[PDB]
């Protein structure tokens, strides 16, 4: 489906998951089809050029729903800095999903234009010995496009990242469990009822993506060894690159979202401690 993202306050930008992944798979077929032979190598600049020429145009197609989007930030900023508004949210949210569903034929064409490019380069991939096909392009590409990312994930503890997040998600829940007592009034009780619900849905997407990230970081690390200092027959080589491309694309899309969804969660926890400034200053007077 789709994924809504509030990285900074006053910033909103969506990601159609099957789309981002479809694009990435064809980017890896483009590079591996180029990096195979030593001669093709120089093509990279034109491929580099093309990816930009296709990405920029997708961003234009998505930026054509800016108004419906800018109407959403308005309905979002209103609930963050305070049924009527609760139902104002769902109608505007359901309006944005329709805008993407409207530009469906618009999106699927940029999608096919890149599939028509990437496969064209893949069809063009020749072998000198189809019996004994080289795997330099696999090693070069991985070591230059995918490896940094494996290190990048192996460095940051994505588990503590969730561990720290439930600890936060817990106290706010402990706060709302005993605030509901006979206190339910003016502490913008609905804002704490909205963000906690909003933050809980964010964590579920993070926990969903981190599993996929931790998943594919094993799969990719295991699968390279099998296809690196050797020479397959074309029939296998053709397949072997696609599998690595299929597995790269997931890792990458699902990773991109884990960083976006991380940032989106803390800008949604900025508006909790700020709306907690109220609750402390409130309760500080009662002892007088």
């Amino acid at each position, epitope marked *: 489906s789709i994924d809504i993202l509030q990285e900074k306050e006053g910033h909103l930008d969506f990601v159609i998951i099957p789309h981002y992944t479809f694009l990435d798979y064809y980017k890896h077929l483009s590079y591996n089809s180029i990096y195979h032979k030593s001669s093709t190598y120089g093509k990279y600049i034109a491929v580099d050029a093309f990816i930009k020429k296709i990405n920029e145009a997708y961003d234009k197609v998505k930026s054509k729903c800016n108004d419906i989007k800018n109407d959403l930030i308005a309905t979002i900023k209103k609930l963050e800095h305070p049924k009527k508004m609760m139902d104002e949210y769902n109608t505007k949210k359901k309006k944005l999903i329709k805008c993407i569903k409207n530009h469906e034929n618009d999106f699927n064409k940029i999608c096919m234009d890149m599939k028509n490019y990437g496969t064209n380069l893949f069809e063009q991939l020749s072998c000198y010995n*189809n019996n004994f096909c080289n795997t330099n392009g696999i090693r070069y590409h991985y070591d230059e496009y995918i490896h940094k990312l494996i290190l990048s994930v192996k460095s940051k503890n994505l588990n503590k990242d969730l561990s720290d997040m439930t600890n936060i998600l817990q106290q706010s829940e402990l706060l709302l469990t005993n605030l509901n007592k006979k206190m339910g009034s003016y502490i913008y009780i609905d804002t704490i009822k909205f963000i906690h619900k909003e933050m809980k849905h964010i964590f579920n997407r993070i926990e969903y993506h981190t599993k996929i990230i931790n998943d594919k970081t094993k799969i990719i690390q295991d699968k390279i060894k099998l296809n690196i200092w050797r020479t397959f027959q074309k029939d296998e080589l053709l397949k072997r690159i696609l599998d690595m491309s299929n597995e790269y694309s997931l890792f990458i899309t699902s990773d991109h979202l884990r960083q976006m969804l991380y940032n989106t969660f803390y800008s949604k926890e900025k508006h909790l401690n700020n709306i907690f400034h109220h609750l402390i200053y409130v309760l500080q007077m009662k002892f007088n």
Partner: antibody
Amino acid sequence: QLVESGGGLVKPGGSLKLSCAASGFTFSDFYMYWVRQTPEKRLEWVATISDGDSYIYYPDSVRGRFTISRDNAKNILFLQMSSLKSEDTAMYFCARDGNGKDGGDAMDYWGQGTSVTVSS
Amino acid sequence: DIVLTQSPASLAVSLGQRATISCRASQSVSTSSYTYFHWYQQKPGQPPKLLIRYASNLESGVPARFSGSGSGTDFTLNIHPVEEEDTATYYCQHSWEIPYTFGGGTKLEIKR
């Protein structure tokens, strides 16, 4: 077209460098070969070099005795000959691989040849 | 190491008749998709010139009379009608394995 130079008379145990001047085409797109033709007309494959020098193949007959190299900048093919036997006496041809999409193409263009002769 | 056996070694042929050269390989040089084999022509005092590309993949400049055939281990180069511009040593080659092997040779000969 291709042109072989560097042949002549070497005593057994000696060394010799053979060059090939590639023209009419984009040298660094093609895999390159060396083929000898003995006086009794037998064709014996000598060496294969990839477009960007990364892959090199030699028959067990010439293993570690001969060295194939290219200078894609100067558009030249080189066969180093070291510690030669009389057995190497032959017409040394340099040749372009076909560069077929589906397959392991033939020796499409063949140079004129250079005579090597290993006799004391 | 693959070995390519050409039958015959020499061949006597009257002008206009049929000429048949057969190459036999130790290992199969084919795949249900490709056939890494090739025929050349070697006119006296000249380098071998590429005659047939794969099985029958004739060359841009090779007449209608020439026709190479086969798959796997057994191949056949057919020349009909034979003319004077045909007297040459014929060599079959393989591009299948690491040891790229050539054939023995087949000297065509016009019977007068």
